[PDB]
Design a protein around this ligand. Structure first.
Ligand SMILES: CC(=O)N1c2cccc(O)c2NC2=C(C(=O)CC(C)(C)C2)[C@@H]1c1ccc(OCc2ccccc2)cc1Cl
Length: 563
């Protein structure tokens, strides 16, 4: 069967769509090669549609059934609570897509009569109706990238598939507790979204150093979402059903599985029948948990199939990394090829074939690799970094255009110890915010899929929790990391690092002059910029922070808001 069938109706935008980075004094001071930065539009959806649409073969085996039973066994431990309409509405992003039936997200959040009645009747319908496919909208997602030269040229838009707001709320009631509890209970330390940045590094390094002779690799599946079959989604349901559930939750999940998750009709922004999905929806609550469970299931089974020895794996939706015991290079290569063949049979064929890796720093997972610097006292300190091209492009875009999500802020938070986040992102964005007296103004970003509202002035204490004091004192980055950043900047026409130091000195002064919370940013975020460096003791209010819901689960596509 096919991931998708199409009527021929176009995937239509519902606004004007911007695709060229503007010429702007502020974005130009970050990045000069503006013609290299673009945003995807629905104009390219057609191309994505081809890519995402294919037939699937899935042959299951005993390794699969064994691993499933073992997961269900752990799932059986869970007891999951039904969320109230109150809690579920408060999880709705303030700018979430309005319902087709009058109300929008503000009315959900205010618990207005229209929204709540509509939500109750959607809920009743999930209990009464077992079969009717629920409708979904299909939109071309606008994301910013840098042009890739002789690599492809330009990326076509990604596609998001989501149900109406009413349903989205009813999903949270039935499932928010499950998707944010079950994956941990099932996969234990292999569940990626449980780790803060510092914890992810520890886990990767400890696992690596714990192996007698480590070999590692990552595995990129070609369109994970389109390769998810309806068996997979039913199997995923079977895991959920092992939870103690309130009866209304149980029916809700059941109806939601047959009616929404397993597949259904697609409609374009103009109300026209677009086609039919028989694979994972990118834009539902279970998308992240479902993908993580499925990736883990298939991957664990395929390990058993390839007889990889003492495997530790770390899964974040479709992103998967394995670290195991080497058995020699020829034999490591053979086992890896067998592993792919097993994934391929489970319907998770690779994008590019996986490459056995013997140095932890040569492994990329979720765009990231471990790298090494030293702290003030000079000790080696591992930390996660990435190629800064995409972040920098997105930052330029966000500096030029008001956008709902500030990826620059997310990148500062998640990649705070990196050379490029400290020297460029912080300098740039604190210089602007300072100029515009927006330091206190809160700003939306996403971490692990969920949406957070963060005040920039709270960044020092956030970074301390997420990374530890170390993140403000790192120096002597690896040659390879420095040169990646250096050439990245030449490519994009970002001023050289030398220039950012100069701009930082100015910014730091201006923050210290301001005193209070602003001055703390100056001291901590920009200590690297000065020669006569300040001693940095732990920030008191760091320990007072409530990051309770920050690194608990993944919610990519799931319409989730924290504050
Ligand atoms: C789409 C998505 O949810 N993710 C993702 C997955 C694969 C790839 C990928 O690039 C991302 N990207 C991002 C993620 C964010 O949380 C926000 C941010 C701005 C950092 C971008 C997030 C992500 C990023 C890194 C990541 O793992 C490596 C890492 C963790 C902590 C600190 C540094 C590195 C995992 C995820 Cl889910």
């Amino acid at each position: 069967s096919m991931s998708y069938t199409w009527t021929g109706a176009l995937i239509t935008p519902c606004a004007a769509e911007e695709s060229k980075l503007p010429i702007n004094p502020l974005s130009n001071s970050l990045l000069r090669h503006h013609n290299m930065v673009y945003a995807t539009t629905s104009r390219s959806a057609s191309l994505r549609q081809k890519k995402v649409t294919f037939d699937r073969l899935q042959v299951l085996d005993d390794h699969y059934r064994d691993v499933l039973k073992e997961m269900k066994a752990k799932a059986s431990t869970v007891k999951a609570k039904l969320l109230s309409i109150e809690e579920a509405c408060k999880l709705t992003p303030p700018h979430s897509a309005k319902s087709k039936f009058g109300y929008g997200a503000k009315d959900v959040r205010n618990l207005s009569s229209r929204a709540v009645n509509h939500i109750r009747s959607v809920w009743e319908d999930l209990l009464e109706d077992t079969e009717t496919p629920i409708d979904t909208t299909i939109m071309a997602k606008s994301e910013v990238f840098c042009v890739q030269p002789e690599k492809g040229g330009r990326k076509p838009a990604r596609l998001i598939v989501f149900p109406d707001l009413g349903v989205r709320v009813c999903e949270k009631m039935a499932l928010y507790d499950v998707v944010s509890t079950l994956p941990q209970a099932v996969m234990g330390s292999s569940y990626g979204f449980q780790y803060s940045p510092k914890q992810r590094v520890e886990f990767l390094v400890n696992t690596w150093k714990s192996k007698k002779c480590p070999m590692g690799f990552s595995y990129d599946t070609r369109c994970f979402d389109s390769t998810v079959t309806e068996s997979d989604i039913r199997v995923e349901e079977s895991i959920y059903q092992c939870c103690d559930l309130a009866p209304e939750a149980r029916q809700a999940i059941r109806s939601l599985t047959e009616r929404l998750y397993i597949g259904g009709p697609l409609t374009n922004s103009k109300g026209q029948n677009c086609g039919y999905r028989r694979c994972r929806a990118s834009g539902v609550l279970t998308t992240s948990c479902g993908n993580t469970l499925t990736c883990y299931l298939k991957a664990t089974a395929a390990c058993r199939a390839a007889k990889l020895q003492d495997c530790t794996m770390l899964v974040n939706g479709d992103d998967l990394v394995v670290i195991c015991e080497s058995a020699g290079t020829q034999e490591d290569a053979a086992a890896l090829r067998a592993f792919t063949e097993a994934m391929t049979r489970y319907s998770a064929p690779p994008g590019d074939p996986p490459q056995p890796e013997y140095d932890l720093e040569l492994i990329t997972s979720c765009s990231s690799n471990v790298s090494v610097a030293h702290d003030a006292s000079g000790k080696r300190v591992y930390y996660l970094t990435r190629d800064p091209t995409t972040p920098l492009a997105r930052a330029a875009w966000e500096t030029a255009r008001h956008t709902p999500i500030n990826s620059w802020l997310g990148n500062i938070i998640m990649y705070a110890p990196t050379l490029w986040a400290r020297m460029i992102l912080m300098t740039h964005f604190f210089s602007i915010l300072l100029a515009q007296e927006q330091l206190e103004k809160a700003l939306d970003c996403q971490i692990y899929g969920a949406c957070y509202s963060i005040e920039p002035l709270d960044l020092p204490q956030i970074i301390e929790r997420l990374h530890g004091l170390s993140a403000f004192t790192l120096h002597s980055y690896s040659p390879g990391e420095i040169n990646r950043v250096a050439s990245c900047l030449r490519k994009l026409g970002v001023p050289p690092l030398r220039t950012w130091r100069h701009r930082a000195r100015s910014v730091r002064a201006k923050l210290l002059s301001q005193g209070g919370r602003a001055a703390t940013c100056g001291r901590y975020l920009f200590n690297w910029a000065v020669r006569t460096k300040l001693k940095l003791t732990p920030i008191p209010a760091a320990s007072q922070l409530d990051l309770s819901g920050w690194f608990v689960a993944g919610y990519s596509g799931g319409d989730i808001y924290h504050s």
